[PDB]
Amino acid sequence: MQSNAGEFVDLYVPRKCSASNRIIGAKDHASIPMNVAEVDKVTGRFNGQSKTYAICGAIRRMGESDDSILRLAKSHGIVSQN
Amino acid sequence: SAKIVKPNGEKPDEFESGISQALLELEMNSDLKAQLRELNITAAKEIEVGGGRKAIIIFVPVPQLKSFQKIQVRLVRELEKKFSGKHVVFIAQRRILPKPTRKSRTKNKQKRPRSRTLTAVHDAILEDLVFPSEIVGKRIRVKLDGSRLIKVHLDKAQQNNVEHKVETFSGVYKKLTGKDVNFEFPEFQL
Amino acid sequence: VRMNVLADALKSINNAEKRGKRQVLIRPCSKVIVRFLTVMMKHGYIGEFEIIDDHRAGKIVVNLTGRLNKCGVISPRFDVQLKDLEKWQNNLLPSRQFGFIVLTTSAGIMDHEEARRKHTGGKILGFFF
Amino acid sequence: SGALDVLQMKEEDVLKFLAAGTHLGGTNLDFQMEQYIYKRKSDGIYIINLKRTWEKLLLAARAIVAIENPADVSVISSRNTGQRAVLKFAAATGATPIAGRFTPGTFTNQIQAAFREPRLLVVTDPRADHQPLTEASYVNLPTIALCNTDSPLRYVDIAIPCNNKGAHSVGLMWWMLAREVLRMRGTISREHPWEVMPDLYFYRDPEE
Amino acid sequence: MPLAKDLLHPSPEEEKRKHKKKRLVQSPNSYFMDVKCPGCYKITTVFSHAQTVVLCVGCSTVLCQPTGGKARLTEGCSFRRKQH
Amino acid sequence: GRMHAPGKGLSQSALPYRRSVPTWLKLTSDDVKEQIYKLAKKGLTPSQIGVILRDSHGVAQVRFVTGNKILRILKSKGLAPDLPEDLYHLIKKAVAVRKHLERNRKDKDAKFRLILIESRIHRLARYYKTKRVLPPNWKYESSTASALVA
RNA sequence: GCUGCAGUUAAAAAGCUCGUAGUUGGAUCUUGUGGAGGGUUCCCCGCCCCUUGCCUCUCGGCGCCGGCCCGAAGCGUUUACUUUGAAAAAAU
C-alpha cells in the first residue's frame, strides 16, 4: 500500500494462494507451500529451478486440494495429459 | 429489360442491372422451371470482404422470399461463375422502425409491430446467411472491454457447404447490422 | 414466484464465491442483469460471462475470481437526491477508499462515483464491494 | 509429461501392475474418487486406469526429490502389509520410517523424546493412519498418500491411486516409488533395468 | 463440486440424461416414427408417446394400445427418427 | 404449486429450439385449416383437436406451421365456442359434485372439496370478465350452472 | 427495533383450510463510425432506417440570386422519479 508521500506502508504483504485466489492469515497452520522439482525432460534428472505453489488451509481442510494441485500442474509439467 | 425488372432502390448501376438481366432470363428458360418462376427482386448490392473477395447480395419482396430460398444453391452456383469468384447470397428486405415515442412523429396510429421492430429483424437476418444449414444453438460472450462476440452453432446438416463460406458471412454481417459474429459447429445435436 | 429477479441472482454469486466456485449458473437472464454484471466486470471484480440463449428467458454462466466479497440487493428501490447519497454511501460500504453502490438514473445504470459527475440522482438498485 | 519416453509409460511395468492386481479397485466411490476410475466391471469391481496412475506417480515423486536434505521425509504405515515395504523404502532413499502404532502428539509436543519435525509425509491408506494426518495441519506439512477408490480425501494434497487391500499391490507400489526418485535425484538412471527386486518390498506373511 | 466445473460447454451425454428442463437448452426426448405394418402399404407417421389408438385404413386398423409411457405396439415393426 | 393441494410437481412439456423441424412435412398452411375445421364439427374442442392432429400426422404444432393457433383458426370461421373450454370444464365438474351431495348427505369430505372447486370458478371468471370475453353482467350461480350444463 | 430486534426449549406461530379488501408480482420491444470536450475504442451535430418526431402553413424578420431556405405556432400516450428555475415574514 502506497501513500501520497510515496511511503510504502504496511508491515508485510501477505501471500495469496493459487488454490482459489484468496489470502491466508499468519496463524493458519494448514496452509502449505509445496515445492515441486523440475527436471530437464530429456533424460529425467534434476535441473535447478523449482516450481512452488501455495494452497490455503480452508480448501485443504474440506478436501479440494487433490484437484487443485492437479489442475495447477496440468497446465505445466510433469502432467500435460492425464 | 434489366433496369426496370427490379423496383426502386439503386436503379442505374451496371453490375446490378446485369445481374437482374441474366437472372430473369434463366427463370424464363426451360433448363429449369420446376424451381424457377419469373418474379422480380427489389434491390441488389455488392459489398466486399477483407478476404480479398467480393460478394453480391440479392434482396426480395418478402412474401416472395419463400420461393427464392427454394432453389438458392443451384441459382447461386450459376451466378458465382457468371460474376466469377464472388459469392452470391439471398436476403430479405425488412423494414425497421424508430420507437413509437419520441423521435419521428406519429399519432400512435399503429402499435409498432414486433415483426417490424429492430431486434426481430436482426434475428431474421442471421437465418438467411447460413440458410442451407439452419441454426441449432446461439451463444454470446462479453469481453472485458465491453465488446460482444456472438457465437453461432450451426447444424452439421450441409456442414461443408457453408464451411467454405464461413468467413465471408462475417464481413457481410458487420456491414449490414454493425454487430460481430463468429461461427462454429458442435458434434452434438438433437 | 420470483418477484425480484436481481435479488435471486446475486445470492447465488454470493454463495458460490464462498465455496470457491469459478463457474456458476444464473437464471433467468434479463437485460437489467446484463448491464449490472457489465459494471461489475469493468472495475475488475469478475471476469467474462457467457449468455446461453433459449427462447424462454436465457441462462448465464460467469467466470469469476476470489476478488468479489459481497454484492447485495436493496429492496424496495429508494430514491436518492445527491445529498441523500452521502448518507447511503456511509451505510453500505466498509470504507471510504473502495466499494461502489450502484444505481439507475435517466442517464443509464452506473456506479455512484460516476452518477455524482453527471449531477443526477435516481433509484438505487444494490451495492457491492 | 513431455520427455521422449524416459518419463512416460514403459511396456515392462504394465505387466507388473497387472500381475499384482493394482488395476482392480474396491466396490465404492467418492465424489473426489471418480476422476481416476474409468468405469465398472460386470462385477462390483471398479477399474482404476493405469495411465492415470502413472502421471500421478511422477509429480508426487518429483516433490519427494525437491527437498535438499532427504532425512526428514517421514514415511508412516500401521497396517501390516505396509510395514515391510516402508522399511526398505527408507533404507533405499534417505527417509525416516515410523512403523506400527503412531503414538499421537508426535509433532505437536515440544517435550517428548520421540519428537520429530519432518517436512513431507507419505502415508499408506488415509483411513488407518488418520492420527498423523489430522496432526499434519498443525505444523504445515504437505501430504501424499495412496488412496483406494473410496478412502476419504481431506488433508491429501496429491493422491497416487492403488488397490491397496493387501496382496502384492502394496509393496509393488512402494517399490516403483523408490525406483523413480533415484532415477531423478541420483545416478541410478540408465533406463535399463534396476537390480533391486519388488519381491523384497512385499509383506513378510506367515512363513513356511 | 470439485471446483473444476465446466458449464460453458455441456458434458458429452451426461448433460443429456438429466431431467429435460435442467438441460442447458431445453429439448423434448420424444420423437416420431414412420410406420408401415404388413398389408397396408402406406407411410403412416406416429408419435412415440401417442396417448391414443392409431388407425390404418387397410386390412390393419389397430397399431397402438395407450400406455402412460410409450404406447405398446400391436406388432413389433418399424422405428424411424424420422430425420430431425 | 397447486392452488388447493399441497403438492409441488413438474410434468410441463418442453418444446425444441428449432421450429421449422422436422422438414419433410406433408401438407402446408391452407391444407391444415380444412383438416382442423372437420374435427370441430365432430364435437372436439381446441385441446383435443391439436392432439388428434399431432399424433397421427406430421404436424408437431399448428403454431409452427401457421401464424395462427387452434383457437384463432376456429375464431376466423366463427366456429369457436361461446365461452372458454377451461371455464366450461370447471362448471361441468361442479354439478356432478352437487349430485353426489344430494344422493349422500353425510359426505362432509365432498362438501369440503366442492368449496375448493367453487372458489376456483370465481377466480377464473374474474380473469375473463375484465378481458371482456364474458358479459360483465354474468355471474356464477347454482341456477346458471343448471342451464349451462343442460 | 424504518435504519435496526425476536418467536424449537428462555415471553411467543391462529387446530386447519378457504377468501374479498390491502400489500407484492416473470421475461420481452436498439448498436457501431468523422468534428468538438477527456482517455487509447469510451462519455454537443450529425450519418446506415432514426436522431431533439412533424407539418403548415400564415401573419409580423434573417438571408442569397419573382424564385427559394431556416428559428417561433400545435406536440411526441399519461405519472411517479430525477435535475433546473420561479416563489417564499422577521427573530432564532
Coordinates of N, CA and C in Angstrom, one line a residue, chain E residues 19, chain F residues 1-2 6-12:
Chain E
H19 N -33.1 -34.5 -16.2 CA -34.4 -34.0 -16.5 C -34.4 -33.0 -17.6
Chain F
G1 N -46.9 -24.1 -7.1 CA -47.6 -25.3 -6.6 C -49.1 -25.2 -6.8
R2 N -49.7 -26.3 -6.5 CA -51.2 -26.5 -6.7 C -51.9 -25.6 -5.8
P6 N -51.3 -29.5 -1.7 CA -50.0 -29.0 -1.1 C -48.9 -29.3 -2.1
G7 N -49.2 -30.3 -3.0 CA -48.1 -30.9 -3.9 C -47.4 -29.9 -4.7
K8 N -46.2 -30.2 -5.1 CA -45.4 -29.4 -5.9 C -44.7 -30.4 -6.9
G9 N -45.0 -30.2 -8.2 CA -44.6 -31.3 -9.1 C -44.1 -30.6 -10.4
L10 N -43.8 -31.4 -11.4 CA -43.4 -31.0 -12.7 C -43.9 -32.0 -13.6
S11 N -44.4 -31.6 -14.8 CA -44.8 -32.5 -15.8 C -44.9 -31.7 -17.1
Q12 N -44.5 -30.4 -17.0 CA -44.6 -29.5 -18.0 C -43.8 -29.9 -19.3

